[PDB]
Amino acid sequence: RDPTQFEERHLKFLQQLGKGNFGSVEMCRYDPLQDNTGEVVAVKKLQHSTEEHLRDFEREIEILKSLQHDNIVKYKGVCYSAGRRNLKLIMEYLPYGSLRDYLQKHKERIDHIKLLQYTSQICKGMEYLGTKRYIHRDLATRNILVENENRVKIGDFGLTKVLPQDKEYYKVKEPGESPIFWYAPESLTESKFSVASDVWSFGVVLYELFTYIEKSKSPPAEFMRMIGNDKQGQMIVFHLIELLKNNGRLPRPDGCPDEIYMIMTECWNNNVNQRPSFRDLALRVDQIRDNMA
């Protein structure tokens, strides 16, 4: 028998781990001996497994399966249902949960050197993703998972796109989910996504880390304050595009080291070509960690 083939009927629900707009993740024990001794795994499934969604989810699964990196969650296998061929994605269970939750919980008990360890690890997962010509589109602490206090991994690829062979961006024609407060200006105006727009989002992740996920300071709270809390629906996108074009940016987080804030603002360059590379970010971050240690 083949360990990447999981039989649905042996997957026992233990608890719900997260829910997003089209999918959820559950903690399950894969327990074919039925004695509660089987492996605990994380299971992603669709809430509305329509034909169109299933096609996208099967691509997402092939994307994950193709990635093998210390800072990318490990694919374990898939569950197939009889008939309509519903799919479940089986992944390693990372027991400290999302980095967003983890940091919200421990706050400044996690110090700067540890935040920079996480930053370096995120940078390296992304740099590796870019070698495969994948654009994540949703890089945010809510999509990063914590294996243990010394290792984080990019943990979800639901918005991930594969670049066409002849172009350095992917244009999304009819967006669903759009985490606009993490989006580069060209992603807001033209729905164009690229390694450089993931770099813009990584700058937002760095902001998240350094604000310790304080709610009143989250990217949506701060951008809504800068455009005015009265803006709603499609007008938020309009005013956010105008704000970014005028160099309105998230503020320096309280207590943030200068050199870290410098990296965020360089990621938030309006000129796509001036944003740094993930290769360079990982070098720079590791130099900072070295200097600090």
Ligand SMILES: NC(=O)c1cc(-c2ccnc(N)n2)[nH]c1-c1cc(C(F)(F)F)ccc1Cl
């Ligand atoms: N939202 C969460 O808090 C959470 C927790 C996990 C998790 C926990 C432990 N191991 C693994 N693989 N995933 N994975 C998620 C998660 C869920 C979703 C969604 F939207 F699909 F449900 C998306 C992204 C993440 Cl990280």
